[PDB]
Enzyme design. Structure first.
Site, PDB file in Angstrom:
ATOM      1  N   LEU A   1      90.053  49.245  36.117  1.00 14.41           N
ATOM      2  CA  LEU A   1      90.914  49.678  35.019  1.00 14.41           C
ATOM      3  C   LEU A   1      90.205  50.677  34.142  1.00 14.41           C
ATOM      4  O   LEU A   1      90.820  51.625  33.655  1.00 14.41           O
ATOM      5  CB  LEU A   1      91.386  48.493  34.195  1.00 14.41           C
ATOM      6  CG  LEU A   1      92.308  48.839  33.016  1.00 14.41           C
ATOM      7  CD1 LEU A   1      93.566  49.558  33.478  1.00 14.41           C
ATOM      8  CD2 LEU A   1      92.684  47.598  32.222  1.00 14.41           C
TER       9      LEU A   1
ATOM     10  N   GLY B   1      84.253  47.978  34.531  1.00 11.17           N
ATOM     11  CA  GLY B   1      85.615  47.552  34.616  1.00 11.17           C
ATOM     12  C   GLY B   1      85.857  46.264  33.884  1.00 11.17           C
ATOM     13  O   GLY B   1      85.158  45.937  32.946  1.00 11.17           O
ATOM     14  N   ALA B   2      86.895  45.542  34.295  1.00  8.12           N
ATOM     15  CA  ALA B   2      87.280  44.308  33.640  1.00  8.12           C
ATOM     16  C   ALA B   2      86.211  43.267  33.844  1.00  8.12           C
ATOM     17  O   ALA B   2      85.650  43.152  34.920  1.00  8.12           O
ATOM     18  CB  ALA B   2      88.614  43.817  34.168  1.00  8.12           C
ATOM     19  N   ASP B   3      85.905  42.552  32.776  1.00  9.68           N
ATOM     20  CA  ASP B   3      84.890  41.519  32.767  1.00  9.68           C
ATOM     21  C   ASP B   3      85.479  40.266  33.394  1.00  9.68           C
ATOM     22  O   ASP B   3      86.382  39.637  32.817  1.00  9.68           O
ATOM     23  CB  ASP B   3      84.489  41.208  31.328  1.00  9.68           C
ATOM     24  CG  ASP B   3      83.187  40.417  31.229  1.00  9.68           C
ATOM     25  OD1 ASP B   3      82.824  39.702  32.183  1.00  9.68           O
ATOM     26  OD2 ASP B   3      82.525  40.522  30.174  1.00  9.68           O
ATOM     27  N   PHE B   4      84.973  39.923  34.577  1.00  7.96           N
ATOM     28  CA  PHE B   4      85.527  38.838  35.382  1.00  7.96           C
ATOM     29  C   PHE B   4      84.866  37.486  35.126  1.00  7.96           C
ATOM     30  O   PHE B   4      85.296  36.484  35.668  1.00  7.96           O
ATOM     31  CB  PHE B   4      85.492  39.199  36.877  1.00  7.96           C
ATOM     32  CG  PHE B   4      86.665  40.014  37.325  1.00  7.96           C
ATOM     33  CD1 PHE B   4      87.944  39.589  37.025  1.00  7.96           C
ATOM     34  CD2 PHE B   4      86.503  41.206  38.030  1.00  7.96           C
ATOM     35  CE1 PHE B   4      89.047  40.315  37.412  1.00  7.96           C
ATOM     36  CE2 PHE B   4      87.610  41.939  38.415  1.00  7.96           C
ATOM     37  CZ  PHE B   4      88.887  41.487  38.104  1.00  7.96           C
TER      38      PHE B   4
END
EC number: 5.3.3.8
Lengths: 256, 256, 257, 259, 257, 259
Positions: free
Chosen positions: E113, E66-69
């Site tokens: 996402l 998913g989104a790279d946090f």
């Protein structure tokens, strides 16, 4: 009262209007005028106040192999408008708007426009687990017909619909059962469609006992309103979009 | 490239694809195949990447008096499916989906299916204040056609639409102007449609100067999505519901 | 065949089913059961195969001043569900689904739920240019009723609807005419609703000559499908959302003054 | 949090859970008109409570609810039924349709009719065991779809299955529920202890909500609801009004007097 | 012709436009600009008249976590509008409107996402029965993204969607299979995504033989119209409704732990 | 009620009114991206304030707003425009679409482009005099519909009129506004005193709300909004994404550099 058709008969038994495809030697393949005839039969069943169920039965090993491809105009467009567009909008509409409970007795495979009609029925009973539905539009150089744009995703799911339609693969018995498309498999041999047909009618006579039949129609009337608009919209667009495929000539060429 | 039609010509001037009804002696009444021809012209204009506007012009004192009622089948139903249903779904669809800006030069009255087509255009210019639209379905024993189910309430209001349709009354110039149906009245004499047609084109050449034409098409594409579904749904249902009126025979009888 | 109602009569003349509000001394204000009666009359007209037009006429100087606010339950909620919710959802539905051409003869002003019913008619004729429609929900501590959520923006435009509804202002004759809400103004004096009613019927008998009447119904069936879903959705939501206004008590307290 | 008492239905709040309990097992939790109204009032109360994130509907005994109680002044038949049937159904159905808290049904046994419609309007359903079923006997009673089943049944069970069951008065059995993902978890507990089932569901729910940002649950539900909210509101109005002619014709009454 | 991205490659083989997430050491976690890049690649595939299928493949044991946090503004709102809102609305739209047949080769789990994008594909093939999709919005202090408001109930059912989304539980393989979400499970080991990717392509080359490929696109064009409006409506609402969650700060604070 | 200051736009609250004032008349109240965002933040603030029932948008000078300010780091052209144009437009448009308070625009002069789109999203519009107009110059700028005009213009002006104006870059003039009931009241005051106009509108509004049950206004608006909310949300997403190819192609930029 209606003309006779050697390929399709009908009769009325009590609350059941029973339509019978009776051309097993040709796998109940249907020409344009036969599809129109089917629509006229539905419209007749629909006007009969004693009818509550319209039951479509066939003969032989196939329900129907689809449009008969064995079986004047200022243009290619005018030709196909008259021959394909008109027939398809009419028959599809007759199924979409039908107010009686529509039951299909699936005695074997159905293909193409005939299989679209099966998908427009309210309830489907299968002779055995060898039935399938095939929508070979990608192979024929055509697109979705008979409201399949809406019915297939609705009854089989969108992902399964893409796999089958994009790659010309059948909706097999297992997929039908997993999606509750078939309400009962009778598990009878393919060699006696007649016995299957009689058995379905016998069970139906049993299942309607005690029911208030106008409730069936009242419920259907509300149920139909869930998707009636989507089906009407898809009918017009399916038939008009198909035209460029016929006019381009590909499906004709492929007709080998 | 397309066949010729003595009743309808077309030409292309720059970004304009210009269609001309050229049968003033018969009030530009149109037969089935002429409506199909119109659809084919729109589909041609739609495929031409140099075209941004499709302009429909006529001749004489009438835009069009509608379907030509001066101008084989297993049933009444099969006949009317082929003749009426098919022609109407096809041409109505061609107007509904057209991607170029559709402009009607209204050189006089329009009636029936022709007047339906006027109501499907994006912009309408009138020769003078004597133009009207008449939808005589109640008098002919018919129902709404050519998407009028949607277009008339949309462009004239629901109450006005009922008064006119239920009682076979025209949508006159005053009603057209009050609803912004006409974008400009040129106030020219009815005796020179040709001059009117030339004047509209001259103003259009002026009005497009400086515009980024693909913006016109991009905007139309979004605008069309407001009602495209309603029009597609109405097309299928109009054409199928009309059938029982033709099959019952009333419009034929009335054809006196 | 149906019970009698001293405030509302009906008769049939040829293809016309004619409903007449006949309580001019009280400005044809209507109680809950009267609205229900109206729905029953529509359902009766709708089942009669000789009827093609349902014509609603009134009496006196007002079409109807609306719900009669002069005129057993485990809770406030149960009370209002039975009294307000049920009546409104039933009568509104009877108008929305009616298959005959619905014509209103507007002999004077209409207010509130009665004015909502006017806005659900297919065609409206006015006695003269002093008619208006008033939807006083903001003043009464209520919200939209009788499908006005849909009918007003549809027939008057969104912006005009907000001005009128948000500030309790009438939709006057000029606004009606500008929007084609009124198909003909008869320009007759307010003192003779009876003459107006007769004149409309006389013109209608003339206008239907030569028409194929089933075409009228066939066209209406298709026209109705443009907005039927929006009306059905609004009906359910209008009646349920009103409930908190009645249960809160504001419209009651406003009634006492 | 204040409302009249009802001996057939209780409620309490434990943390973020508003718990509604049908407590009349001796009569299979059959419900009268006013009880359906009461249910709607309880949902509206849970909906206004800012500490509530989940509304849990639990029952008692071997049935969830056998449906409308058919043991349990008007100018016309129409006026009567408008007041008694129409109003009650539109109100309670609406209360479920619009509810903003996560609605969970603990299905401790079968549900029938309008009560089963309400089960089908819940967001999540947990079953006590594989003997639960839902029955919608409208065709047998001389009625039509109620409580938003017009939309909910095709949506959650498929169209074809819905026609087979509704047209022929057949139950939606456990297998069909499981095949359609209608049941999110079968607890496989004995039918004789609904209480233990109810407590076990709540115990798991307390575990499952740990660490969650609960306003996210409501924010998501708000968007999810918008997929079908219009279809449900449209169906509610049509269902209740179309039913009227069945009540006014008298068939369901006759059929009631034939036990 | 488009910029290079070290995390994502593409190539064209006949009628197939093949996109490859190539950052297995980081579980193919994606930053905002990577999602934008993906949208640009779809728009490129969509404009290429020789392309009929757009195939999305990944690398390693995850499809994408998913989104790279791990990975200037007048307000918190302006920041998040630029960073979150814009990226999400753009990439989601690129998937929703794509006209070529979109096929996902699911070589392992997908999260957030990225998992939303999987659910927007037309056809999904799984490497083996250990794949799952996780939408951890409730845990992150967020809401539905990438059209999941529509896609999840559509492809998994409403009730299953609520259980999974409300309680942060995965849509596991069995659920995927029961709903026909996966069109074929290849049953290959997780250690060779590369072999799986090659095997899918090999089967696809076989399956397209004899087909009239414009028919595929023509059918898709009609199929897409079933839900296009719902997806477009959800996209706008999802991105705007998320904003208050980012602006409130909860997902940030949850990120730091 | 707390938010950063913006020298181009102020706000205050008087009773039930939240009043937003464009205060940059020397530049015709032209707005940069961040100013449109700021407007959205102000609407969201008014929307959360339980004492507010009406949100009133007023301007200054002879123009309401000349639109986007065209005087006033990225891996691609696409990334740039997504950040600058797409994000700003979706956000502000959404803020207007979903606003729950009655939105009133005081139109003190012309509005252009995105600012004019915002006027068309208001619930009620009052004009200073008959010289106001709205211009949507997309065809001239090499752009397409913005700020929900795809839906609002046909809805409030009719389809045919909308095509004439949009396709040929023509204004929606006062007469067209009046004919379509777009303007609820023309105050017929001189263009040179926007201030007096603004004050007069507020004075009338204070008169008109007397005696009203203000929650009824919001309750009604909530139902009214549902007529078109879906069409607006669908248009917002499509408008902003379709615009991108126009910005990325470069035409509107070129056209900007030709003054």
């Amino acid at each position: 009262e209606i003309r006779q058709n050697e390929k399709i008969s009908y009769r009325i038994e009590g609350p059941f209007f029973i339509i019978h495809l009776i051309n097993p030697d040709n796998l109940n393949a249907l020409e344009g005028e036969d599809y129109i005839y089917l629509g006229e039969l539905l419209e007749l069943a629909d006007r009969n106040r004693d009818v509550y169920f319209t039951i479509i039965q066939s003969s032989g090993r196939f329900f129907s192999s689809g449009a008969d491809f064995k079986g004047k105009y200022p243009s290619e467009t005018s030709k196909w408008v008259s021959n394909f567009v008109a027939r398809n909008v009419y028959v599809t509409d007759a199924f979409i708007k039908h107010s009686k409970v529509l039951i299909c007795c699936l005695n074997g495979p159905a293909i193409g426009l005939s299989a679209a009609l099966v998908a427009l029925c309210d309830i489907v009973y299968s002779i055995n687990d060898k039935v399938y539905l095939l929508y070979p539009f990608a192979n024929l150089g055509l697109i979705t017909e008979g409201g399949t744009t809406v019915s297939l995703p609705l009854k089989f799911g969108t992902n399964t619909t893409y796999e089958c339609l994009m790659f010309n693969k059948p909706f097999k018995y297992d997929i039908m059962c997993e999606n509750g498309f078939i309400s009962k498999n009778f598990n009878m041999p393919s060699s006696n469609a007649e016995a299957f047909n009689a058995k379905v009618l016998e069970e139906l006579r049993e299942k309607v006992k005690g029911l208030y039949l106008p409730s069936c129609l009242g419920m259907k009337k509300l149920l139909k309103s869930n998707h009636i608009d989507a089906f009407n919209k898809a009918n017009s667009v399916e038939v008009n979009e198909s035209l460029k495929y016929w006019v381009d000539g590909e499906p004709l060429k492929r007709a080998r």
